[PDB]
Design a binder for this molecule. Structure first.
Ligand SMILES: [Cu+2]
Ligand SMILES: [Cu+2]
Ligand SMILES: [Cu+2]
Ligand SMILES: [Cu+2]
Ligand SMILES: [Cu+2]
Length: 440
């Protein structure tokens, strides 16, 4: 409506305090040229971006104006599971105040969304999500300060009768993807760049859709992963963002013109059903159709800044004291999903660890679908996936596993208490692919 490029409204802390009341409410709005009622925080889709600095106080009162219970997960924030409480239920009509201090050693793009087990997928799909940006002193170095910065919330949607389409049985098996492939709730927006270097914060807030990102004629310079900066920029030709992952990239516009940002074809192992004679058997859907995410218009005679030579040194972690093995398996036709052969039970503790120790987690995907594995509260360092060493050091909290692959994670245990790990194809979490970690 206003600036060519739609981005969520930003709410900033004031004098070190971000005090805000958000309502979760069915909201009529215009989206992608049609009128629809979505479930929104703060009356908008996506919800407002919260922008804070380390050591700020966040005081967020969530008013539940939905007809079902809900809660908030502060995705990626290494804060206490007593605040980021995955078992809390806020009944319809009730409110709850989340109060926490932003950790001192923290930077990057995080997000908030519901985490009430069994109702996550319908609520997230309906529009309940927003970003949280932790700004850092590193944002003052000239190579970042002088770049043009934008948030890109990647989230798809399907509408039916002016509401989010309901989940089908097949949706619970695959994770629901929609035909409206949106950026900040907008359909294929145009970004008319004014600076030759762009700094793009990227958030995959979809239930299940993957974004194999590629900018026409350009590489991307990765500078942050889910939970923090890399140590130095990493040049990549494309960047896969699984559900729940974040990244930040620098884009260095090489010449005038129009360049498409696309989600290239990607096969995550979703399944259909076919009947060819007697059959009635499951069959791969194959790769996603390519999608145009936005149009990027370069400015006249672009002369991008030099890349930063360094970002943030990654901490040297203490030697680990235990190795864990978590195997992921599937029962596709039952839409049931397991970790070490079990479905979630909120009464059952599955792993018991010691705060301020480091653990090695070997997560093995023995299913046929991609599974993006997420751990609350305790960001990790991905060492390797599928036997390939990871090409950078940075904090992550979601790691994608293709079929058969093992991820080896270095997991420093931070805040004490009971938290969860789960697949971030949230339909799979709702259907049991989640476990309980207790840190003492
Ligand atoms: Cu999440
Ligand atoms: Cu979670
Ligand atoms: Cu199906
Ligand atoms: Cu299948
Ligand atoms: Cu999964």
């Amino acid at each position: 409506g206003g600036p060519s490029f739609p981005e969520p409204k930003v709410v900033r802390s004031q004098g070190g305090l971000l005090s805000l009341k958000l309502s979760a409410t069915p909201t009529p709005l215009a989206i992608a040229g049609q009128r629809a009622t979505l479930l929104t925080y703060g009356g908008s889709f996506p919800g407002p971006t919260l922008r804070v600095r380390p050591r700020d106080t966040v005081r967020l009162t969530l008013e539940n104006r939905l007809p079902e219970p809900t809660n908030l997960h502060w995705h990626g924030l290494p804060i206490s599971p007593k605040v980021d409480d995955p078992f809390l239920e806020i009944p319809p009509g009730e409110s709850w105040t989340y109060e926490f201090t932003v950790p001192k050693e923290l930077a990057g793009t995080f997000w908030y969304h519901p985490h009430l087990h069994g109702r996550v997928a319908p609520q997230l799909f309906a529009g309940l999500l927003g970003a949280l940006v932790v700004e850092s002193s590193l944002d003052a170095i000239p190579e970042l300060r002088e770049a043009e910065e934008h948030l890109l919330v990647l989230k798809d949607l399907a509408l039916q009768g002016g509401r989010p389409a309901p989940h089908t049985p097949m949706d619970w098996m695959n994770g629901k993807e929609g035909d409206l492939v949106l950026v900040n709730g907008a359909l294929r927006p145009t970004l008319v760049a004014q600076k030759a270097t762009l700094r793009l914060r990227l958030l995959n807030a979809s239930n299940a859709r993957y974004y194999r990102l590629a900018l026409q004629d350009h590489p991307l310079y990765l500078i942050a992963a889910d939970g923090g900066f890399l140590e130095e920029p990493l040049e990549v030709s494309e960047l896969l963002l699984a559900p729940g992952e974040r990244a930040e990239v620098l884009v260095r516009l090489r010449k005038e013109g129009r360049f498409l940002l696309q989600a290239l074809p990607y096969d995550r192992g979703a399944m259909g059903m076919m009947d060819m004679g007697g059959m009635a058997h499951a069959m791969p859907q194959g790769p996603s159709r390519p999608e145009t995410l936005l149009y990027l218009i370069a400015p006249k005679n672009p002369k991008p800044l030099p890349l930063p030579k360094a970002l943030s040194p990654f901490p040297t972690l203490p030697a680990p004291v235990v190795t864990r093995r978590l195997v992921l398996t599937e029962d596709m036709m039952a839409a049931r999903f397991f970790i070490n052969g079990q479905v979630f039970d909120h009464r059952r503790v599955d792993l018991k660890g010691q705060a301020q120790t480091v653990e090695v987690w070997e997560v093995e995907n023995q299913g046929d679908m991609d599974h993006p594995f997420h751990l609350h509260v305790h960001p990790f360092q991905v060492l390797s996936v599928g036997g390939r060493p990871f090409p950078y050091r940075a904090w992550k909290d979601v790691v994608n596993l293709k079929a058969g692959e093992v991820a080896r994670l270095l997991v420093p245990l931070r805040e004490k208490g009971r938290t969860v790990f789960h697949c971030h194809i949230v339909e799979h979490e709702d259907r049991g692919m989640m476990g309980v970690l207790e840190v003492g």
